[PDB]
Design a protein around this ligand. Structure first.
Ligand SMILES: Cc1ccccc1CNC(=O)[C@H](CCc1ccccc1)NC(=O)[C@@H](NC(=O)c1ccc(OCc2ccccc2)cc1)[C@@H](C)O
Ligand SMILES: [Mg+2]
Ligand SMILES: [Mg+2]
Lengths: 235, 250, 198, 237, 241, 233, 242, 212
């Protein structure tokens, strides 16, 4: 919590240092949907893929997060975020506006930064949500409790390299299908693995409910990731 | 009277490490090997009963523990930390689930509760992390069979098969070689026994090995008849004798 | 007993509220505005026990205004009414429960529809074409069952309201010194300053 | 304090003991139907009012306490000893047995070696009295440790006092009466003063005897005190 | 349950943690406030580093505390949210109890109090934030501008700036602000604000953001196109000699 | 031996010493001298008040606790205030509940026990003030000396503060004479005033310098300052 | 770094001592007690010409009969002033009279003691000592006009004249010479204004220095700029003529 | 008790009686039912003496505190709301007080607030409070004009309390008169009903219910 001569928060800095070793997570926002892609931490053949969800979590029916850092810390925070959404729904009979939920999570993080002499949460979040005020949104929050809005962003390892690439190929008028390609291309380029294969990936979208007028979250099954990986020509 | 260390004893270091969590993991390394293997119709968790004395009675110390009628646990690391985690885990299955929904928690949820208890020992004031890694195997109606590893940091991961503790690197290799998705439970118990023989120094028999399964419902273990929709525990500790039968065909 | 009426016409919601404040054998006031604006397009009227009435209203007003500034946004009439219900629901099982009944009239800019909510002190909420609290409803509900149309203009709504105030003036045993009338629509809240002899 | 050293010791408690050794010498003697407590009072100056700086303390009506080391710590123990004796009497009606009372102090003193927010007590206390089944004498160190004693000494003249104490036990295995042990207490306190002979002293004695005080704790004063001072004066030369 | 003191006195008389809180402000994006004759203008820089942002949803540095008062800050962005929330609550509470919106001085005094309080309480650190609070008292046309710092010190300024390179822009404002002559209107006051940021920003694109407060709850932000016209006009007009 | 052993009051030095308490004792030696003494009928406090400038008032050194009791201070003054208020309450408590004037000895015991808890609690310093307490109770005149260590001793006379060793040696010598000064308030004060003089490398003790307090057989505890001490200079 | 209330081997409280050094860094404040009033004066010391100086509150009213001047970390003084005001108004509620100046000072000093965490024997609601000294000036019927110097050590002294702040060392020696028991209120006003001008870093005008007094009759007043200016003419003319 | 305050062309008239009762016992005839909070603020008292006396004196302290904190006199609206809110904290504990807070500020103009122990707080031009209120109201209402002179208004005030003191068993003693202006309260004296009744009967030819 204490300040340094420089006016930096040691523990926050070191928590951010920790995160830059976590598998990269990418978020890209398009006009008709949002993409969340993330790379799993160097796994094993024996790891159960079908019953695993380490980097992507559903918050309510209209919001999700991609995680970078200590999962166990992230689960603590996810759970409170889930409750906050339900409290708001119960108070107002309306789904929580995306920003309000992000601010609240961020404020819990700020608190561990200012009082109590507990360590901060070693977690960075990318929030992907839709509400009827701002449409599709993308936010980022780190252990400092700061949060910012984006059109495309990454957290974890190689954000530096991944950001430059996204800056290059991102165009405001993108469809979701174009953003899917961009996210996978970007992960492929920046990976410290050889091939970027399905079993090293978590993937999700927020679209316009196939054919409806409603908003739908698809958390890709492993098989779906393998198909969408051949499609975009990385086999 | 009153704690002085109301601050976190696990802090971030200049490089981003959480020392105490690292050092607890080093404790898990020093501990006796334990493992889990998932089959099509069950899970097996196994470990070695490493004894403090030949004058000790090793039957009085269970390393394998029933958590709920369908969930069981084993560990590597510091025994006493395990013991108290098991107590809290059993309680939490009641307080946070059965007393609410009238049924036992599914595996992932209980694992999640255990993870939370360990996560907290990593953040709270004036405590060290737990010096254990657990393997939690179980069954529930809607998820089928599962095996989870839980680490001192609070992290859990689902496994088809895995080993923790002393010979874990070699044993994990020996499992990647042998595991497939057509395995019957009997095949898995057989593999568990083979994998454990590389780890065991001394005698290898039903007295020195501890082995439990999450298999089928055991109505003879229920204690009452009459209610037809209650069929019994799926958790079952194999006996000394039962182990030896699978060692003469090993 | 305090008259509190609301009628929802096609493009607006109209609130009418008695002007008297009576303690004992004395009418202390004949110009009491039993209303609080919660936001530019939401109005709430109230009746109940002596002190809790204004205290509740102003507390809700502070909260909705806080929200607006935090979010730079106006909460839908439906969200404000849900907030109000929950506050009353918590209150009924508290140590000393707020004894206030309310009408919430709002124009919902995102749907372009007027909305009327009747909520009593228990936290019983219901959306209505027209509503009332206290004894006045024992007269006005039947009148409006007869005279009300879903497509009425604001002006027709004011005639229908005048018809309601006439019935109460004739048949209610108490002198409530006429009403203050307020209209909530897309262009906000405005008061009809002439009604007492309009 | 909550810190074990590499070889199992508690350096803080060990240092606490050096404070005790630094203190005045006090003793206790178990006669055949009671107990005698005596203490050396260093006279810093003639300005100190004689007889009026009482060190020996009573707990309940039947227990005496004497201690060496940081006096304030001893008073802190006796306060707690009193609360603990009231509490016992309240629930159980009977005044507290001496071994029961011993353990109460024992546990309380031990508690102060469990936490880093606390320092061990800087005293050893010699205490005892008469209960339902006889006389008891106890000594309790800074660590919480306590045992039953026939005779006990602590403080500066601890070593020479124990030497005298050991002799009495050998010559009189069959009893020592309350009236006798009072005399010998005075003697032993004179024979521990030899070390601190540069500064003057004053003698305090109390006893708790079934036949002499009817099992209550009483201060030895007047003619009885004077006679015991004479015995010690005559037997020093 | 943790109250171990972190902010304490140094041999030479300073409170080390507060002094370091000021260093956090020193490295925060620059912010500037200047008050005209019948308005106040607030300007803030956005860092060049990341330009793939979403400007619709990203929290902007100027905040409404109430309908007639605004707040900008420099230092830790997360810290500022705690002050802004508290300030907003206090504002509603003041209207509820006194039956009147807050004066700018009052709100400033309150925010400064929260800041001060965090410099002398066990187990909390001071706010790594300095604020500029600006607006008009109810039923008043005389413009107000105030500044707070982590110590809890506060004061009114004709014009002021905080954050990185505030030293340079303060220098610029000292020369260019005439107290007897304040800028006569919105247009010319905005221009001076943009000019002061131009001394430090060096593209000023949508990097410069402006907000204008006028009497009786009239607060408007400026879009990119409007600031553009100010930036272009400043650099063209100022070249030839 | 001196190294990491003066961190707090919760650490023993390898010698068995408590340095925080020993350092608190040093704040007394820093304080302005004060003298107390008694006979069978009266007890007297005499204190050298100290200014902090020539434009300042001399800061008060004598505090009344009850009608039959009061104290003088040397060391940290705010600590004297904390302690005297406690004593004021204990005296008050005894009057209200038991209709009983507090024995001066009991006031000793109470102050001692209060000091003690600050020699054992982590994150709390000891009291940094020495006190001399006088009173007339049901067994006569009494004088106590209070040390921050908790040690309270009943004396016929004593002195504490800077250069106090002078006054103490004089009082040790005068003993047999002042113990007998009975039924003469003014003689005992003059004996105490001259006793405080042995402790002056200072200056000549002026009418602002001097602070005298008295209590006895038929005199409530009363403080003398300014013009009213002139007749003892 | 060990504790916030540790004794040094000399027998002094570490943190208390340093808080006194923080006061030495503050602006100068001067008080002079006559028989016709007490004068409080301060150096404003704006940190820049853009700072609107009359927003510098370093002389505050406590009650009608009590005012104070501060010097040091001046934000620390907010809650001391609030406490003082509450004490005075509260005293008047309980007792329907004015609180004695000495009593009010003691109350402020009791507040200053409550640093640490909650020391054993009673509770400390504050983590460090205050970093600010106060000159409390007022009038009560018992002891007339009074000037007290309240230190974060919790001691207070009465003074005929007193200077605190960065200019304090020199300003005090000056007072030792100029102060006599006879001074009128107009004389005291000139002395505060003179001695401030001596120790200030800018040239003293009616903007960087503030004057106030407290008289039994008119209560406590902060002199406005127009009035101090006319006294700053008047001091210029008196010194240029000597 | 009877207390009244009304607004007119030339400010505010505050008038009260001075009788204290416990049951049917006349406890006192010379009681102060007006509190002078500050030079521009008045409070009236009806109901429980102690409740009023204690909480209106306290209100004075709270107002004074506002002056120090804000360097400005407290608005009537805010002064009334302090008392309003305090009383509300005590709702159902049995506080019994009828109260008017009357005064002047630049921003508000002359203002009257009625505040009772039910928590009711109302702004208005005319209030009568107390067991005699109806009696005062009868006289006051029937002779009230906005444009009454200062002299007339003071008398109408005076006369209305007399009306009430005569009819209500629990009112009487003396009338206490106040005028509140932009500059602002001025006391217009104490008027014992012992003399005032007979004087007013004579001069005005009213009170014909009374023999002799
Ligand atoms: C506005 C005001 C302000 C100042 C002066 C007068 C008034 C007008 N106002 C009254 O005169 C009222 C009318 C009665 C009234 C009382 C209360 C509410 C409404 C009306 N009288 C009192 O308050 C008198 N006391 C009493 O009446 C009592 C006070 C306490 C008692 O205590 C009894 C008790 C004690 C212990 C336990 C239980 C009961 C009994 C009578 C007092 C003039 O001595
Ligand atoms: Mg410990
Ligand atoms: Mg011994």
């Amino acid at each position: 919590t204490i300040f340094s001569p420089e006016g930096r928060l040691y523990q926050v800095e070191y928590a951010l240092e920790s995160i830059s070793h976590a598998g990269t997570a990418i978020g890209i926002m398009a006009s008709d949907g949002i993409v969340l892609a993330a790379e799993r931490k160097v796994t094993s053949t024996l790891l159960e893929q079908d019953t695993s969800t380490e980097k992507l979590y559903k918050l309510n029916d209209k919001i999700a997060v991609a995680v970078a850092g200590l999962t166990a810390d992230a689960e603590i925070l996810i759970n409170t975020a889930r409750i906050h959404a339900q409290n708001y729904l119960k108070t107002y009979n309306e789904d929580i506006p995306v920003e309000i939920l992000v601010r609240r999570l961020s404020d819990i993080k700020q608190g561990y930064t200012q009082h109590g002499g507990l360590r901060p949460f070693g977690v960075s979040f990318i929030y992907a949500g839709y509400d009827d005020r701002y449409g599709y949104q993308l936010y980022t929050s780190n252990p400092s409790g700061n949060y910012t809005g984006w059109k495309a962003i990454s957290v974890g390892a190689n954000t530096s390299a991944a950001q430059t690439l996204l800056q290059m190929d991102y165009k405001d008028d993108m469809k979701v299908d174009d953003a899917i390609e961009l996210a996978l291309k970007t992960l492929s380029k920046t990976t410290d693995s050889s091939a970027l294969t399905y079993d090293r990936l978590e993937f999700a979208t927020i679209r316009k409910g196939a054919n409806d007028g409603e908003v739908y979250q698809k958390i890709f099954k492993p098989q779906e990731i393998k198909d969408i990986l051949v499609k975009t020509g990385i086999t | 009277m009153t704690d002085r260390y109301s601050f976190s004893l696990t802090t971030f270091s200049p490089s981003g490490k959480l020392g105490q969590i690292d050092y607890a993991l080093t404790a898990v390394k020093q501990g006796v090997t334990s493992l889990g293997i998932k089959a099509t119709n069950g899970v097996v968790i196994a470990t070695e009963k490493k004894s403090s004395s030949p004058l000790a009675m090793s039957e009085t110390l269970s390393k394998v523990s029933l958590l709920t009628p369908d969930i069981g646990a084993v560990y590597s690391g510091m025994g006493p930390d395990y013991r108290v985690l098991v107590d809290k885990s059993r309680k939490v299955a009641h307080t946070s689930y059965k007393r609410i929904y009238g049924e036992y928690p599914p595996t992932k949820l209980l694992v999640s509760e255990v993870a939370k208890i360990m996560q907290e020992a990593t953040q709270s004031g004036g405590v060290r992390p737990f010096g254990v890694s657990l393997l939690i195997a179980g069954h529930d109606e809607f998820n089928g069979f599962s095996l989870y590893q839980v680490d001192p940091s609070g992290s859990y991961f689902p496994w088809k098969a895995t080993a923790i503790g002393k010979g874990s690197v070699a044993a994990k290799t020996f499992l990647e070689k042998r595991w497939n998705d057509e395995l019957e439970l009997e095949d898995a118990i057989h593999i568990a026994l083979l994998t454990l023989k590389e780890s065991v120094e001394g005698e290898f028999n039903g007295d020195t090995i501890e082995l439990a399964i999450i298999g089928d419902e055991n109505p003879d273990l229920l204690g009452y008849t009459g209610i037809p929709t209650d069929k019994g525990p799926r958790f079952r500790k194999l006996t000394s004798q039962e182990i030896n039968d699978r060692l003469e065909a090993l | 007993m305090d008259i509190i009426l609301g009628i929802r016409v096609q493009d607006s919601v109209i609130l009418a509220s008695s002007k008297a404040v009576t303690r004992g054998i004395s009418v202390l006031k004949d110009s009491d505005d039993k209303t609080r604006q919660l936001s530019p397009h939401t109005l709430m009227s109230f009746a109940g026990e002596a002190g809790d009435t204004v205290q509740f209203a102003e507390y809700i007003q502070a909260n909705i205004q806080l929200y607006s500034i935090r979010e730079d946004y106006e909460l839908s009439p439906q969200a404000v009414s849900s907030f109000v219900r929950q506050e009353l629901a918590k209150s009924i099982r508290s140590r000393r429960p707020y004894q206030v009944n309310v009408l919430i009239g709002g124009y919902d800019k995102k749907k372009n529809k007027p909305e009327l909510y009747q909520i009593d002190y228990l936290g019983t909420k219901v959306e209505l074409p027209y509503g009332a609290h206290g004894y006045s409803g024992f007269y006005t509900f039947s009148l409006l069952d007869h005279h009300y149309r879903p497509d009425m203009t604001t002006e027709e709504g004011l005639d229908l309201l005048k018809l309601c105030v006439q019935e109460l003036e004739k048949r209610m045993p108490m002198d409530f010194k006429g009403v203050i009338v307020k209209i909530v629509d897309k262009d906000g809240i405005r008061q009809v300053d002439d009604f007492q002899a309009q | 304090n909550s810190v074990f050293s590499p070889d199992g010791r508690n350096f803080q408690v060990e240092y606490a003991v050096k404070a005790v050794e630094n203190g005045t010498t006090s003793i206790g003697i178990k006669c055949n139907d009671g107990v005698v407590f005596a203490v050396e009072k260093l006279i810093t100056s003639k300005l100190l009012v004689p007889q009026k700086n009482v060190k020996i303390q009573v707990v309940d009506r039947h227990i005496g306490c004497v201690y060496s080391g940081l006096i304030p710590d001893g008073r802190h123990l006796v306060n707690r000893g009193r609360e603990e004796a009231a509490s016992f009497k309240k629930l159980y009606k009977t005044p507290i047995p001496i071994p029961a009372f011993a353990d109460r102090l024992g546990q309380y003193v031990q508690a102060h070696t469990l936490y880093n927010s606390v320092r061990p007590f800087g005293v050893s206390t010699i205490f005892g009295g008469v209960d339902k089944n006889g006389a008891h004498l106890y000594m309790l160190e800074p660590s919480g440790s306590y045992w039953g004693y026939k005779g006990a000494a602590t403080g500066k003249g601890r070593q020479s006092a124990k030497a005298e104490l050991e002799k009495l036990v050998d010559h009189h295995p069959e009893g020592l009466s309350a009236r006798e042990a009072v005399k010998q207490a005075a003697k032993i306190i004179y024979l521990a003063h030899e070390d601190n002979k540069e500064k003057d002293f004053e003698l305090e004695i109390s006893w708790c005897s079934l036949s002499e005080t009817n099992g209550l704790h009483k201060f030895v004063k007047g003619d009885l005190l004077q006679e015991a001072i004479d015995f010690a004066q005559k037997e020093i030369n | 349950g943790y109250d171990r003191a972190l902010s304490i006195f140094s041999p030479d008389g300073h409170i080390f943690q507060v002094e370091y809180a000021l260093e956090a402000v020193k490295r925060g994006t620059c912010a500037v406030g200047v008050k005209g004759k019948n308005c106040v203008v607030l300007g803030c820089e956005r860092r060049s580093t990341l330009k793939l942002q979403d400007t619709r949803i990203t929290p902007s540095k100027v905040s409404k505390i109430d309908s007639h008062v605004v707040l900008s800050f420099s230092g830790l962005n997360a810290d500022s949210r705690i002050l802004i929330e508290k300030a907003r609550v206090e504002a509603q509470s003041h209207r509820l109890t006194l039956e009147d919106p807050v004066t700018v001085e009052y709100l400033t005094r309150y925010v400064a109090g929260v800041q001060q309080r965090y410099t002398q309480s066990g187990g909390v650190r001071p706010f790594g934030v300095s604020t500029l609070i600006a607006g008009f008292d109810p039923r008043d046309d005389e413009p107000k501008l105030y500044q707070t710092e982590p110590s809890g010190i506060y004061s009114s300024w004709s014009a002021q700036t905080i954050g990185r390179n505030s030293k340079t822009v303060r220098e610029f404002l000292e020369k260019n602000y005439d107290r007897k002559e304040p800028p006569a209107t919105v247009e010319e006051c905005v221009k001076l604000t943009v000019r002061s940021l131009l001394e430090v920003v060096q593209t000023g694109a949508k990097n410069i953001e402006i907000t204008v407060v006028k009497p009786d709850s009239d607060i408007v932000a400026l879009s990119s196109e409007e600031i553009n016209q100010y930036v272009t006009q400043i650099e063209q007009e100022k070249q030839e000699q | 031996f001196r190294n990491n052993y003066d961190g707090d009051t919760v650490t023993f030095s390898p010698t068995g010493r408590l340095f925080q308490v020993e350092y608190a004792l040093e704040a007394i030696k820093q304080g302005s001298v004060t003298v107390g003494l008694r006979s069978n009928t009266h007890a007297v406090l005499v204190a050298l008040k100290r200014n902090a400038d020539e434009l300042s008032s001399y800061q008060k050194k004598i505090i009344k606790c009850d009608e039959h009791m009061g104290l003088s201070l040397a060391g940290l003054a705010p600590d004297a205030r904390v302690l005297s208020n406690y004593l004021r309450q204990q005296c008050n408590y005894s009057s209200l509940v038991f209709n009983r004037k507090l024995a001066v000895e009991r006031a000793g015991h109470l102050l001692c026990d209060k000091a003690q808890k600050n020699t054992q609690s982590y994150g709390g310093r000891p009291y940094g003030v020495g006190l001399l307490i006088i009173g007339y109770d049901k067994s006569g005149a009494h004088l106590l000396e209070f040390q921050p260590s908790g040690n309270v001793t009943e004396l016929y006379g004593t002195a504490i503060g800077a250069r106090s060793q002078g006054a103490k040696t004089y009082l040790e010598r005068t003993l047999d004479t002042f113990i007998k000064i009975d039924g003469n308030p003014d003689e005992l004060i003059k004996a105490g005033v001259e006793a405080i003089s042995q402790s002056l490398r200072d200056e000549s003790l002026t009418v602002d310098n001097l602070s005298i307090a008295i209590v006895g057989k038929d005199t409530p505890f009363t403080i003398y300052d300014g013009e009213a001490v002139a007749k003892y200079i | 770094d060990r504790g916030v209330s540790t004794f040094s081997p000399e027998g002094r409280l570490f943190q208390v001592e340093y808080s006194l050094e923080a006061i030495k860094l503050g602006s100068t404040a001067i008080g002079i007690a006559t028989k016709e009033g007490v004068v409080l004066g301060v150096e404003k010391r704006a940190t820049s010409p853009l700072l609107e100086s009359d927003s510098i509150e370093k002389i505050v009213e406590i009650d009608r009969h009590i005012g104070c001047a501060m010097s040091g970390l001046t934000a620390d003084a907010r809650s001391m002033i609030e406490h003082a005001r509450t004490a005075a108004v509260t005293h008047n509620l309980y007792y329907d009279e004015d609180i004695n100046v000495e009593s009010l000072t003691q109350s402020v000093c009791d507040l200053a003691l409550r640093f640490g965490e909650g020391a054993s024997g009673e509770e400390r609601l504050m983590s460090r000592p205050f970093g600010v000294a106060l000159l409390i000036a007022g009038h009560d019927a018992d002891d007339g006009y009074q000037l007290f110097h309240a230190e974060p050590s919790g001691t207070f002294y009465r003074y005929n004249a007193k200077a605190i702040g960065s200019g304090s060392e020199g300003a005090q020696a000056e007072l030792l010479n100029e102060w006599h028991s006879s001074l009128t209120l107009k004389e005291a006003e000139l002395l505060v204004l003179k001695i401030l001008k001596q120790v200030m870093e800018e040239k003293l005008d009616e903007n960087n220095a503030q004057l106030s007094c407290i008289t039994k009759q008119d209560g406590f007043k902060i002199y406005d700029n127009e009035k101090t200016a006319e006294l700053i003419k008047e001091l210029k003319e008196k010194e240029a003529a000597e | 008790t009877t207390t009244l305050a009304f607004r007119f062309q030339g400010g505010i008239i505050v008038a009260v009686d001075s009788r204290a009762t416990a049951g049917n016992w006349v406890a006192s005839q010379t009681v102060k039912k007006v509190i002078e909070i500050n030079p521009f603020l008045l409070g009236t008292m009806a109901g429980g003496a102690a409740d009023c006396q204690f909480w209106e004196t306290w209100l004075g302290s709270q107002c004074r505190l506002h002056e120090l904190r804000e360097k400005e006199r407290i608005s009537v609206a805010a002064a009334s709301k302090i008392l309003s809110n305090l009383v509300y904290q005590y709702k159902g504990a049995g506080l019994s007080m009828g109260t008017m807070i009357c005064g002047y500020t630049r921003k508000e103009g002359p203002t009257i607030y009625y505040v009772d122990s039910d928590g009711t707080r109302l702004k208005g031009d005319i209030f009568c409070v107390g067991s005699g209120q109806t009696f005062a109201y009868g006289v006051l209402d029937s002779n009230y004009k906005w444009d009454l002179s200062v002299e007339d208004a003071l008398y109408l005030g005076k006369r209305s309390i007399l009306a009430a003191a005569h009819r209500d068993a629990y009112s009487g003693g003396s009338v206490n008169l106040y005028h509140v202006t932009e500059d602002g309260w001025i006391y217009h004296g104490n008027h014992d009903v012992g003399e005032l009744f007979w004087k007013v009967k004579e001069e005005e030819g009213s009170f014909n219910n009374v023999i002799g």
